[PDB]
């Protein structure tokens, strides 16, 4: 019983100001797990989409800007695909565009400048040894919807120049999931 | 965003005993509302099924028997399709079948054998006038799915033949319904 | 070294009387192991079936009735298949047949019927996350034929009404396996 | 329940030197039973192959010499099919090569050297008459699997040249077989 | 961004002398893990590779003999293909060739003969189940290579015929590897 | 063993203001070495990237600006590709622009655009008598990857014409290379 459909959550992220001359680059992760798209059901049934199973095709992340078209110190960025819970570590002012010659890059252009990405992302089944799945349709995984326990996928780390002001973005994550067997419960009232 | 699902329900119903020697039915009618099949759901999506709009499309009403086959005093009744909230009138022993001259008359053979009827039902609009739409699936009229004042559908009555030993059966129904317009609320937690 | 073969088994399941006048049923679940089904072996050869892999391909399922034909008080129930080690709690006499509204579900006329299941089972690899992979012949896992740790297959789940009298069952497992690399071992005498 | 496979088998066949001066050759026979490749098995299965009958299709010995290539007093023997189990005497020095004019000889040459045979041996079903089929896979026998008692099967004897020094060989035997009726047993544990 | 490349390495095997009279065999096991392939690197690239993912598609083992042509007292050995982590246990003097039986088992000549083996490994995902998958390029799991912790790649056993004499092997694995996402890191000096 | 990648580096530069009214022009160079982009290996291997021999493909100098739209003063400049290491000597304030009758010459609007310029470098063999090859992918030259004395490349000169306010740019350079001769050195630890 295949249900295709679409989720979306939005929150926000901020750049902080720095005093530093240097081009610098701030570093920070992004995971994405179901429970924060999906709330929990009421009764007996365990979450409020009726299904058993589910398995996630497409991730739509968009970065819209807060910030002014007349701002400026503008810079430029990059943001990558990371498909293995094993990103580089979180920095406020590295002195490097870590993201940059990775094969999934894309331009960040900052700070008024809409940011879009769209690929499958991979779950993690084992951080010790991080092993994933080929794009295949076909093939991928069904995984349970657990009750409040869902693991964490994962596929987006940023990389953002500072800058003197402060650079905020309003992020809204886009799930395109496939659910399986109907499993909707009704007892007598 | 159509979905088309299937949802059912259980119950009984029994045609008690008489000692009447002569052949007497049993005279009952049969509605169909969505709240018997589908709960309430829980936070801000007031129903389980995530949707705003619904039509019915089909109903199938299964008389399962609870008798044995060894029973006798068997008898022959009849099942209508009453499409405007206007049946007969309950009885317990009336001298004639009334449903059995009807357009939409099937024999139900008694008390062991089994009795399907698969037909389109019609929502309770106006009870004063009881007007109703021919079937058209591109031109059905479409319902809100109330939190917990869904209007009755009706389209079912029958009329059972007595006999010396109780008739029970155990009434399965389904109904097959379209869904629109998907409408998961997804707060903070 | 394919071997593609069959191997059978067979054990009872009561569902006992209950002075419950409402409809109520039964619910149990189903694993399947093979260890069950293949006896540990002799000597060098820790088997009875001198293979290394093995991978099962299907399982039947058959309920083959206790009961005779003119018992009454008969039922309806539902059988699903449930691919992942997260049943419906077992229960001795539930309001509502949970099994009902599942993709999966095949109606189980009681007492005196028969019932088959013809599926394809899948293995417990995490009952953490509880993964498996869909239908395919050419991409399914092989697993170790251990010597006494094989690990469990699931994949149903039963739903059976309640009755006064005690509804008994011979239910036959068979398990179409796919074995491979030959390992016999010939040591002298 | 057909299952064609290969056993093996592997032992030690040595040929001491001699004193004489004249061509002397060494005369052996080699049988095959199957109770030396195929071990007993464990509990109610009584063989660690499980079925019931088998039939010999070929038979493949390998003589792999121990010695050196640097070896002198090189010489020549032969090796032929012999379906009866009535063989030449078994001797130490004999003046003449008994098996040179048969019309299944194969050349020997010694020491250091490769032989091959592939054939289809015949079983022993009556010493006294020494009766057997022609070649023939359709109408060829189906024995049965005995627990300790299976019949000699037979097809080579050789003669080899004496020497100066001690000729060490490895016999590899590898047969081709074909078993049928899977005959597996599952007593509870 | 693919690269497929190939790595060596170079080690040695001994089977060591005894003065047993009968046919023994020697069995020993070999596991393949890239860090023995592949050094450490320096600096903000942890390996020498600049590669984030890996997976091994052939391995080639080579025994290149150390002992010369005329050396006696030959023998003949298996070498098994085993993807699982569970091997014959290592022995010094085995009465039989646990591996001659298997599918995958090709003949070793000994003392002074080549012998390779070209075969695709698999992964120790998990050692208590013990699952892998078969051949499929376009399906083939790709692990993250790790700083100091990769995965052992499993897939050969072998049993070597002793001897009066040592025998001695040069041992070259080579894995034929597929990158995935070069991930070099370029920090300003 | 040939290996087309990307390398890429980021840096700044600023045309410094002035209070001269006329339009003057600030000139400066730009030189490629892949030292700037290939950091020291570690180890065995001098180099990240295990590689004997170069040759730089193209090269994209991207000038992504600093300043905001809102900026005036806006002016118009040029950027020429120079193969031969005798640039236009680098002047603050020149009366004209020297680059713009070249044959290369691509206009810089000013100062909040951006400008790209894609071209084919040379190596400085020999500063003397500056002789370089004509584009042919085929016959172009490979050079060696040092360990820290490569020959710098160049082609790329600029004009930016002054204005009362800092122009400031952050300058992208990626240069497409080849590599060849895969040279990993793998010793043990
Ligand atoms: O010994 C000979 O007579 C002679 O042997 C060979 O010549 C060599 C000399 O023997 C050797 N000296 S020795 O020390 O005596 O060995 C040296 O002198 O060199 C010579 C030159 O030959 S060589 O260069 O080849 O060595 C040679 O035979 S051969 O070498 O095998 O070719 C022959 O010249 C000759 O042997 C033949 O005759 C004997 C004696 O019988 S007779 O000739 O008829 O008188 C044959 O013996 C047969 O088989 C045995 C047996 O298999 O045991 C007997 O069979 C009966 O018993 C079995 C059961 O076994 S038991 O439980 O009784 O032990 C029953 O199941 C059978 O049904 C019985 N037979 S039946 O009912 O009559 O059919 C019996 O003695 C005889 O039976 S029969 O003849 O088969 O019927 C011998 O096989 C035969 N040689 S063969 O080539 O045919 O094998």
């Known amino acids: 019983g295949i249900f295709n459909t679409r989720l979306s959550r939005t929150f ?24 924060d798209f999906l709330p929990p059901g009421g009764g007996s049934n365990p979450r409020s989409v009726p299904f ?23 810079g430029v960025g990059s943001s990558a695909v990371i498909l293995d819970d094993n990103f580089v570590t979180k920095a406020t002012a590295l002195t490097y565009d870590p993201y940059v010659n990775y094969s999934s890059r894309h331009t960040i252009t900052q700070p008024f400048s809409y940011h879009s990405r769209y690929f499958t992302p991979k779950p993690v089944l084992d951080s010790t040894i991080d092993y994933f799945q080929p794009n295949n349709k076909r093939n991928q995984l069904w995984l349970r919807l657990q009750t ?11 990389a953002f ?5 402060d650079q905020e973005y309003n992020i809204r994550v886009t799930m395109y999931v496939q659910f399986r067997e109907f499993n909707l419960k009704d007892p007598p009232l």
């Not at 120049?161 to 002001?165: K, T």
């Open 161 to 165: 120049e500072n800058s003197i002001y």
């Open 148 to 158: 409040a326990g869902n693991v964490d996928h994962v596929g987006l780390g940023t």
């Open 52 to 74: 058993e199973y589910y398995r996630i095709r497409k991730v739509k992340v968009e970065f819209w800007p807060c910030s002014p078209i007349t701002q400026g110190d503008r």
């Open 12 to 35: 926000g992220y901020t750049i902080k100001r720095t005093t530093v001359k240097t081009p610098s680059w701030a570093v920070d992760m992004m995971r994405f797990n179901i429970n």
